[PDB]
Amino acid sequence: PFTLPNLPLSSLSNSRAPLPISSMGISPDNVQSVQFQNGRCTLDGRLVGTTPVSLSHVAKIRGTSNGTVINLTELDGTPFHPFEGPAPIGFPDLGGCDWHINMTQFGHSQTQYDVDTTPDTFVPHLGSIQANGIGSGNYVGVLSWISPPSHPSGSQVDLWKIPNYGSTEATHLAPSVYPPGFGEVLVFFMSKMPGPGAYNLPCLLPQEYISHLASEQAPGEAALLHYVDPDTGRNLGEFKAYPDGFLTCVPNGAGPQQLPINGVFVFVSWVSRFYQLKPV
């Protein structure tokens, strides 16, 4: 029988960053569809985009700086070529912001790497990004803290966005995720990302939800889920999981931000895609 981890969201991690999930949320009105590259997984077990199985590959980078540019490899160190994807597996998919990643080495005793994902020099899709000061050597890097994007100009952090991966155009992005509609809204798992702001990082799935799905490769139009409270067992609400790997729910007016996070999504049964959900 289909399953989801019998684990509170409050003890799970974001899938776009190695961060504990602090809550659920809904996207703003100027956010229609979403095209996150990490944290993409079908209920089939199929990983999508640059999404890795483990939280340990999430939002990291590997490569060698020649002093002016950094050529990328898989976290593994094995070659990465354009045809494979928009960037190496686990590559940071946070758009609308500047990056500051901790760079360390194997065999050498760290260096902040300030990344502006805006110039023509940021071409992770061709395995090469600006080595903005990072000296020569091979490095391991993890996103640590973000800041406003330096060029949209005077712009604020917008994590619903994806960074520009090429230019060069056909980077092979995973498809966009659209709300099924009929009042249903996309559910996002939020996490607090360090930086001089009140940054909330959404994602369609908790990192462990993906490993469980990838493993529990069980072969349904839509999954009717119950957000249940562990100890009492009371059904805190109804939800629907879709094949492409995301959850919906109908807000009980102008939703999920109101529910506690120590709850667990339980698979009740498979249902019709147009199954009218009870307000939350």
From Swiss-Prot:
Residues 1-49 are annotated as: P1 sub-domain 1. It comes from the Viruses. Residues 1-280 are annotated as: Protruding domain. Residues 50-173 are annotated as: P2 sub-domain. Residues 174-280 are annotated as: P1 sub-domain 2. The soluble capsid protein may play a role in viral immunoevasion. This is Soluble capsid protein. It comes from Norovirus (strain Human/NoV/United States/Norwalk/1968/GI) (Hu/NV/NV/1968/US). The chain holds residues 230 to 516 of 530 of the full protein.
